[PDB]
């Protein structure tokens, strides 16, 4: 009769469709919890992320809606795909909560991070990662936010991307959890005005990290981050200082000049393999994608259609996947009440 069943996941109340058995708890984070189901429609495996009242305050609600539309706009392997959406309420007065059910992944791109990866396995994800900016840029979609957390990959190295960033507009949070800003452009630390390759940037960071196996620009916030980036990469050039905003131009400019490290000393032939020819090149041709993605002025930074044809990545290039055809739009503030209504809106297609 009932077409749901309550199961308790740490804490959380998970009320799903009887389809959806042996939930267990996969993963954690601001907007949501997500387990790990079996689906006995579809006899396949599944992740189920449950959005708690996801209209109970302007960030929450811009995300949950903007997320439910723009999963609408793109189709693409590299990036999520939803199996289904559904709430356990019956009516908008009783709606709380949205349940969203994708392909069951096997890791987190944090995990993968951690291992020792050749350049094979290494070079086919960073391609994946392209792959996805790139059709997401295709749709008009400027992420601004891609990190290692958001990013899922399956045993057979196969990789997508979960979230679709910042909002095109902007906020507060009243839960304990901090927002990880450690990939996030100079573009987007000093607040300047960018383009589709401010998405660059944060692949350099997570193919940097997978070399270093330790986050390359850390920080309690922006201030311990950009003194990070310039250690490390040395003091931006006259021309980049012209495109900041004149108060954040003088505290920029004023900070200790730096003539920053070169990328053999950033990156060692030590953190490559690099003991037949084939990997000593590879391990050059790893350094020199690093150097053109981790470039302070984006007039400097190598683009997504550059990187993508990059002797180390290249190698992967199938027409098929590079270009997957792109086809209204909301910027608006609103009470929680609207928001519920919105998003139960797009739950009850
Ligand atoms: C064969 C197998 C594999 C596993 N998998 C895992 O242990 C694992 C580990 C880390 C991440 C994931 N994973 C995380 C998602 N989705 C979301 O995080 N967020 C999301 C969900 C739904 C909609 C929108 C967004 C997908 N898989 C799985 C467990 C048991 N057996």
Known sequence: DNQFYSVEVGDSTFTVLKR????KPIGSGAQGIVCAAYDAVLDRNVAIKKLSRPFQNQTHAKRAYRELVLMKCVNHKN??????????????????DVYLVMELMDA?????????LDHERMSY????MLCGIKHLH????????????????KSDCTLKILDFGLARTASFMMTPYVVTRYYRAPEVILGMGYKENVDIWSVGCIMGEMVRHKILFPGRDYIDQ??????????????????????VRNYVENR??????????????????????????????????LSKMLVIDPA??????????????????????????????DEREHTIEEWKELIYKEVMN
């Open 125 to 128: 994800l960073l391609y994946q």
């Open 226 to 247: 950009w003194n990070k980036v310039i250690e490390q990469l040395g003091t931006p050039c006259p021309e980049f200082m012209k495109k900041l905003q004149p108060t």
């Open 20 to 23: 959806y058995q042996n939930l």
């Open 79 to 96: 990036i999520i795909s939803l199996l289904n959406v559904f709430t356990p309420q019956k009516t908008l007065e009783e709606f709380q």
């Open 108 to 116: 987190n791109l944090c995990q993968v991070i951690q291992m020792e």
């Open 138 to 153: 295709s749709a008009g979609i400027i992420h601004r936010d891609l990190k290692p957390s958001n990013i899922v990959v």
């Open 256 to 289: 200790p000049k730096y003539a920053g490290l070169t990328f053999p000393k950033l990156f060692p032939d030590s953190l490559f393999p690099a003991d037949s020819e084939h990997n000593k090149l590879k391990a050059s041709q790893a350094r020199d994608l």
């Open 300 to 329: 400097k930074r190598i683009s997504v259609d550059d990187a993508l044809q990059h002797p180390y990545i290249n190698v992967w290039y199938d027409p098929a996947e590079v270009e997957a055809p792109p086809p209204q739009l």
